């Protein structure tokens, strides 16, 4: 037995923080999101593939639209790989395809930008191909694009790395 | 009854019924006995999203919009052309029928 049902289907649209008048349409697609579980709401992230504008938002469960940070990319096309938050530290990371590892350290009280940090706590040569935060935080994992494996910890120093080849496969199957 | 069983298909209602619970003992399967698109009776509404009975008699079918729920309610006498009875609407966000 079990059916499984639907009880709410609650949707909207993560409107861009305006910032001379261009209330319309920026292009401001969405780009990722992540589940706010210290407060009961939704931290989404909408960006734009030319400029490098992002505006990460943390949506309140009460209609708060907190914009909590917003700014540009250096490569400013590649895609976001990965983003998270954290609650402790209360700071957003972002990975980007080029090697963007980029911290945003925000405020309790005041979430208006320009009252954040912006780091960039280091860069991939030539790119990433894809990226995961453990359930836990406490280390992050990715590889590059030219098949090499690194896992690092949260404070961002290198737990360890692997050149990702093709012989391991041919050795380990017993088929 | 116990005779007359519905399914939501996207858009569409599915009535299926055994003559009786007897002859669902000898072996006859429950059949489909009427199909009453979402577009028969409005030709177009969000999607429906659970349905109830009433005594044999009438089917309530819950269905969300995009900010209220509307609660379809349908005559199952005559299974082949069901009949639509008034539309009634809840001003709140029904989550469970």
């Known amino acids: 037995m079990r059916n499984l049902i639907t009880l709410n289907k609650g949707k909207f649209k993560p409107t861009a923080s305006t910032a001379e008048g261009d209330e319309d349409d920026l292009s401001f697609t969405l780009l990722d999101s992540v589940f706010d579980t210290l407060s009961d709401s939704i931290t989404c992230v909408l960006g734009s593939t030319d400029i490098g504008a992002i505006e990460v938002q943390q949506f309140m469960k009460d209609g708060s639209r907190n914009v909590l940070a917003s700014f ?12 998270v938050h954290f ?3 209360n700071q957003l990371v972002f990975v980007f395809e080029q090697g963007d590892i980029i911290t945003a350290t925000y405020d309790p009280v005041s979430l208006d930008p320009a009252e954040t940090l912006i780091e960039i706590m280091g860069t991939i040569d030539n790119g990433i191909a894809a990226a995961q ?3 836990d935080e406490e280390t992050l994992a ?15 120093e290198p737990i360890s790395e692997y050149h990702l080849e093709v012989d391991d496969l041919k050795i380990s199957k017993h088929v | 009854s116990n ?15 055994v003559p009786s619970i007897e002859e669902m003992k000898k072996g006859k399967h429950p059949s489909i006995v009427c199909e009453f698109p979402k577009s ?14 009433i005594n044999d008699s009438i089917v309530g079918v819950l269905l969300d919009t995009d900010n209220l729920s509307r609660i379809a309610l349908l005559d199952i006498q005559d299974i082949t052309q069901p009949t639509l009875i008034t539309i009634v609407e809840v001003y709140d966000k029904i989550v469970l029928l």
């Not at chain 1, 540009?72 to 983003?83: A, E, G, P, R």
């Not at chain 2, 028969?40 to 009975?53: G, I, K, P, Y």
């Open chain 2, 3 to 17: 005779e007359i069983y519905a399914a939501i298909n996207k858009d569409v209602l599915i009535f299926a019924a």
């Open chain 1, 87 to 89: 609650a402790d530290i």
């Open chain 1, 142 to 156: 990715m590889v590059t694009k030219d098949r090499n494996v690194v896992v690092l910890s949260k404070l961002f």
């Open chain 2, 40 to 53: 028969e009776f409005t030709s177009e509404v969000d999607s429906l999203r659970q349905v109830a009975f």
């Open chain 1, 72 to 83: 540009n990319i250096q490569t400013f096309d590649d895609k976001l790989l990965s983003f």
């Open chain 1, 133 to 135: 935060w453990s359930y």
